[PDB]
Amino acid sequence: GSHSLKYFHTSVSRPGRGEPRFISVGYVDDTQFVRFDNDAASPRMVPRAPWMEQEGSEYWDRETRSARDTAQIFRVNLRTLRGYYNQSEAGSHTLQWMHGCELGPDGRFLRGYEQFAYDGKDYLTLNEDLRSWTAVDTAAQISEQKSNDASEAEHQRAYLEDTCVEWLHKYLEKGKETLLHLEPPKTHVTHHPISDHEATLRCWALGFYPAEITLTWQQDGEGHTQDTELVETRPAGDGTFQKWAAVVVPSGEEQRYTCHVQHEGLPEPVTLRW
Amino acid sequence: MIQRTPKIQVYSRHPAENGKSNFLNCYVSGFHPSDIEVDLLKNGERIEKVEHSDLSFSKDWSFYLLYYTEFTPTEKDEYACRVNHVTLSQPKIVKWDRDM
Amino acid sequence: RQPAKAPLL
């Protein structure tokens, strides 16, 4: 199947309290595997997946240097952006950076992306052609010109098509036993009477990986039962995910309702009744 | 400036069984800015030494975090999550329901 | 691994 190597960088300025807080995390598919947090005297990039301890000290030293330098660059960018918008020093502001490379089912480079946001809104985008930028306003147009002056699109294209692709291949091989292992959901249905005439049927999906999943309550010919309550897919805390879907049914008709669960770890979709 | 209030889910890692070791989770997601206060409560009292995951965000730039601790569910103990954020006029308390 | 040099804005 398809796979992705993704990083998320966040820098938040702390007025009157020193350098901005900087936190970055790396993901392979739906699995976090590294983290960097500058809230320390000697901040380090550290593993967040057990299979990354196969990486030696040189890897960790290099990633620590890269992340420390990114934080300093982001402190500069926050100051630059504060001047672009003529904003006071008394206000807290946020700069975010996300980038990633995605492989197709053939294992070849399919798409790369890179984007910046300021105070929770799109700021500057590296287009999927990997050769041009798009600015959201006049401030970001100056940032676009800087990127043009430095051939930044060419530099980021090289990272996304070469460095990113190569290391995604390495990570997938080192963590194959978990990254390439589809974990099917464990499913069951719970029943909670609301009154003498109504009841809640809750269809559970527990302990699955990856996070992509579909839950539907079927009521005879209606595949998506009216007023089905879906919760956002949520992490269990152990690397797997959870989700449930609930419906209120007339008491005594629970047998007319069927829950469908579709997940890539299931050879066929599963149906359940209370 | 884009601000988003956090969505809140309080739940256990495994199906709750009284007297059995488990993990109480509080998942805050879809919020901006990243600064947030999350507390886990046992019978209205704050639980000490609660850990949380590394700050990450989604495609729309909104952040998400998982707060978690070890707990022992019982019949009478009342667990809840208390969330405070710049978008909230007052702190929000969401009780733990073992059926949700 | 992550980029060595992050873009300037």
Side-chain angles (χ1 to χ4, degrees):
Chain A
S2 290
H3 300 283
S4 64
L5 171 59
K6 300 175 165 178
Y7 288 85
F8 303 85
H9 312 256
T10 304
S11 184
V12 188
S13 62
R14 307 181 298 110
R17 285 165 60 242
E19 285 190 352
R21 179 75 175 273
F22 183 87
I23 300 167
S24 63
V25 297
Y27 281 80
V28 175
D29 302 341
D30 295 330
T31 302
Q32 189 199 346
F33 72 104
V34 289
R35 177 270 291 169
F36 177 86
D37 191 333
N38 80 334
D39 188 9
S42 179
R44 298 289 300 189
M45 187 89 76
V46 296
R48 308 299 284 111
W51 47 268
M52 279 298 293
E53 298 277 3
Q54 300 179 57
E55 286 295 334
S57 60
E58 283 184 15
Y59 177 90
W60 295 115
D61 291 350
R62 180 171 181 173
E63 289 312 276
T64 296
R65 289 188 300 261
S66 297
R68 289 177 178 172
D69 288 347
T70 301
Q72 295 301 321
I73 292 296
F74 275 46
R75 179 182 175 189
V76 174
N77 288 344
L78 278 171
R79 193 154 288 150
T80 305
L81 287 183
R82 196 179 67 244
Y84 287 164
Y85 295 108
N86 196 14
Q87 294 166 328
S88 166
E89 188 181 3
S92 178
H93 298 276
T94 305
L95 179 62
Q96 285 164 276
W97 187 32
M98 65 177 182
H99 57 77
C101 58
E102 298 173 350
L103 302 182
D106 60 352
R108 301 188 180 92
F109 179 81
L110 181 62
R111 182 178 79 105
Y113 67 90
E114 184 159 331
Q115 206 176 16
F116 291 83
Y118 186 57
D119 288 336
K121 177 178 69 180
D122 286 3
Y123 181 77
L124 182 67
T125 303
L126 178 66
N127 294 320
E128 286 73 23
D129 55 24
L130 307 182
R131 52 177 166 86
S132 62
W133 303 85
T134 299
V136 78
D137 59 6
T138 308
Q141 286 179 246
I142 304 177
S143 300
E144 171 179 357
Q145 288 183 281
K146 288 188 185 182
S147 304
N148 291 338
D149 300 335
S151 296
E152 196 57 60
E154 177 180 358
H155 295 328
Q156 298 309 308
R157 185 175 68 255
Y159 165 78
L160 294 171
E161 292 182 350
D162 301 332
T163 299
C164 189
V165 174
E166 167 184 331
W167 279 95
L168 178 51
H169 285 342
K170 292 182 181 175
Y171 297 149
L172 289 170
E173 177 67 29
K174 291 172 181 296
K176 59 195 297 188
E177 288 182 2
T178 56
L179 294 176
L180 300 183
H181 177 75
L182 301 174
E183 191 70 28
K186 280 167 182 172
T187 57
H188 72 281
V189 168
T190 59
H191 177 262
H192 317 275
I194 296 285
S195 63
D196 292 355
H197 292 61
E198 285 185 319
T200 295
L201 294 174
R202 183 163 289 106
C203 183
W204 291 84
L206 294 175
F208 54 90
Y209 180 93
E212 172 66 36
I213 198 173
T214 311
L215 299 183
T216 53
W217 269 109
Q218 178 193 14
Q219 177 201 344
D220 297 322
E222 174 58 80
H224 298 175
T225 307
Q226 180 193 325
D227 298 305
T228 296
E229 183 184 5
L230 275 171
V231 292
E232 172 176 1
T233 302
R234 62 200 194 189
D238 57 6
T240 66
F241 298 88
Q242 307 178 354
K243 197 186 193 69
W244 58 255
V247 54
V248 175
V249 309
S251 175
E253 293 186 25
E254 288 91 335
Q255 67 290 351
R256 307 170 63 258
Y257 291 79
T258 294
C259 176
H260 303 238
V261 185
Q262 173 70 306
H263 187 265
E264 195 180 358
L266 299 164
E268 312 167 4
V270 187
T271 52
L272 302 89
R273 296 186 296 276
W274 174 61
Chain B
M1 169 102 27
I2 286 185
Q3 294 179 302
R4 308 178 176 273
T5 207
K7 304 178 182 185
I8 308 171
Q9 291 192 68
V10 194
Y11 57 104
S12 50
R13 174 179 303 185
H14 309 286
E17 310 183 71
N18 288 336
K20 291 303 180 186
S21 185
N22 209 331
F23 280 89
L24 176 65
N25 297 330
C26 186
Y27 188 55
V28 288
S29 59
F31 61 91
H32 219 292
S34 58
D35 177 59
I36 190 163
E37 279 187 358
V38 180
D39 287 310
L40 303 184
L41 307 178
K42 178 188 178 179
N43 293 315
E45 298 179 356
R46 190 180 54 87
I47 300 174
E48 192 183 358
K49 297 168 187 179
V50 170
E51 301 194 79
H52 66 80
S53 60
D54 295 313
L55 186 66
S56 184
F57 53 87
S58 300
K59 178 187 171 175
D60 67 355
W61 308 107
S62 69
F63 300 101
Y64 56 89
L65 283 170
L66 169 68
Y67 286 72
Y68 60 98
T69 191
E70 177 263 347
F71 82 131
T72 293
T74 66
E75 172 183 284
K76 297 184 189 62
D77 286 317
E78 295 156 342
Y79 292 97
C81 188
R82 186 170 58 200
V83 174
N84 193 10
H85 190 257
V86 296
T87 54
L88 295 177
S89 321
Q90 59 186 352
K92 189 179 297 182
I93 297 179
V94 176
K95 303 176 182 183
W96 171 55
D97 188 327
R98 74 178 63 205
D99 302 320
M100 288 181 49
Chain C
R1 60 185 175 206
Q2 66 150 104
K5 312 214 297 183
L8 292 154
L9 306 177

